[PDB]
Amino acid sequence: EHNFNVVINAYDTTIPELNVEGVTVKNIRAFNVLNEPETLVVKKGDAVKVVVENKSPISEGFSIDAFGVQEVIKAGETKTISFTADKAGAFTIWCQLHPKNIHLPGTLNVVE
């Protein structure tokens, strides 16, 4: 395990009624695509390798502007994304294909 494993999953949740242990919640409807895990932490200078498996039914994106990373993983495909974390800081990991509050963003933290 010299690299990170990230699974992109789609979640289609429709629960018009939920009563658990006597507590009730109504009209729940949320659709989202998640990166699991969302956060990747590395040291400055580290050679980063992220094996992204897209389990979403559609093509998904993986982007980190700071390091020119911008990929599109086909549905069911697995792509290894590699780059060198030559800059310290916090950088958003996002999908350039869907609304950010649908396919929620993650973070790449490069510590000193």
Q: Which does 99 bind (CB under 5 to 8 A by kind): a copy of itself, Cu ion, none?
A: a copy of itself
92 vs 20: CA distance, rounded Å: 36
Q: Which residues contact 33 (CB under 8 A, 6 or more apart)?
A: 8, 9, 10, 11, 56, 60, 95, 98, 102, 103, 104
Q: Using the Cα atoms of residue 16, residue 19, residue 20 and residue 23 in order, give the sign of their dihedral.
A: positive
Are 97 and 103 in contact by the 8 Å Cβ rule? The answer is yes
Is 60 annotated as contributing to ligand binding?
yes
Helix (H) or strand (E) holding 79: strand 78-84
Q: How far is the CB of 78 from a copy of itself (least distance, A)?
A: 17
Q: Which does 90 bind (CB under 5 to 8 A by kind): Cu ion, a copy of itself, none?
A: a copy of itself
Q: How far is the CB of 106 from Cu ion (least distance, A)?
A: 11
- Give the residues lining the site for a copy of itself (CB under 8 A): 1-6, 9, 11-15, 18, 20-21, 23, 25, 27-32, 34, 36-43, 57-59, 75, 87-94, 99-102, 104-109, 111-112
- Give the residues lining the site for Cu ion (CB under 5 A): 33, 60, 95, 97-98, 103
Annotated binding residues, written as ranges, equal 60, 95, 98, 103
